Design a protein around this ligand. Structure first.
Ligand SMILES: CCc1cc2c(cc1OS(N)(=O)=O)CC[C@@H]1[C@@H]2CC[C@]2(C)[C@@H](O)CC[C@@H]12
Ligand SMILES: [Zn+2]
Length: 258
């Protein structure tokens, strides 16, 4: 009876195994755009993905991860609120059963159809497992998806999903360029928070882009054909794999823009 997103093991249950669920810097949150404060002094984001080396795509039973070779500085995030250099290790998404829900963060209570998480770790901690133990260990770039025009740079991801339908399946996934998933603007909101799934560690500097990307109805429909279950187990569609907004508590969300 491990954690998931169902009635009996979903977000309202997680605190029993992971009491930090009720902690002081949990994610996601609602971004109240009127209350976020512009922070001049915030630096421009630097996203350097030209040498990114994707390796594999994996269905892990709650999402699918596109994993990268993070054994050298090849794809890094710097600047913004960040001190130092953070290396891209993977990206994944959260999405809904309907276009009207699926994002983890909300904007003035608005839910998007999905949310992309580009996960990076602070190189001063040597590797990802040590980084998640630190309050400034990770930087996650969050990008909202709305349904409209297709995102051509997403299509290679969509087309391999048939090969990783069930939990534990993986496939080769080389030469994928994550620059094709970024919106035009890098304007962002930032706040200190956590992993959004168990173990809910409070190790993340969240950087959430203001501008969503558009994906087509057919693209997000293909996400919804994935399974939470393993092969040969009863089929449960991988949909609504999002945690709802958590209390902001004693945090201020900062904006990079007026
Ligand atoms: C930031 C991406 C991330 C990493 C991890 C999870 C979840 C992720 O999603 S999210 N939405 O970006 O927060 C949950 C499983 C975690 C993992 C970090 C590494 C571990 C903590 C392992 O040491 C033990 C369980 C693993
Ligand atoms: Zn995530």
């Amino acid at each position: 009876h491990h954690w998931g997103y169902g009635k009996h093991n979903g977000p309202e249950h997680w605190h029993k195994d992971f009491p930090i669920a009720k902690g002081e810097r949990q994610s996601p949150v609602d971004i109240d755009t009127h209350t976020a404060k512009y922070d001049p002094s915030l630096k421009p984001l630097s996203v350097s993905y030209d040498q990114a080396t994707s390796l594999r795509i994996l269905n892990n039973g709650h999402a699918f991860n596109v994993e990268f070779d993070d054994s050298q500085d090849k794809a890094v995030l710097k600047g913004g609120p960040l001190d130092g250099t953070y290396r891209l290790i993977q990206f994944h998404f959260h999405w809904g059963s309907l276009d009207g829900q699926g994002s983890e963060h909300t904007v003035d209570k608005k839910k998007y159809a999905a949310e992309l998480h580009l996960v990076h770790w602070n190189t001063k901690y040597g590797d990802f497992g040590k980084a998640v133990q630190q309050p400034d260990g990770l930087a996650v770039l969050g990008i909202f998806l709305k349904v409209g025009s297709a995102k051509p740079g997403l299509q290679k991801v969509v087309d391999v999903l048939d090969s990783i339908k069930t939990k534990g399946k993986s496939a080769d996934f080389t030469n994928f360029d994550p620059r094709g998933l970024l919106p035009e603007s890098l304007d962002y909101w930032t706040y200190p928070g956590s992993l959004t799934t168990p173990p809910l560690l409070e190790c993340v500097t969240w950087i959430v882009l203001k501008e969503p990307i558009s994906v087509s109805s057919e693209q997000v429909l293909k996400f919804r054909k994935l399974n939470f279950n393993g092969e040969g187990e009863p089929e449960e569609l991988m949909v609504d794999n999002w945690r709802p907004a958590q209390p902001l508590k004693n945090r201020q969300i900062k904006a990079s823009f007026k």
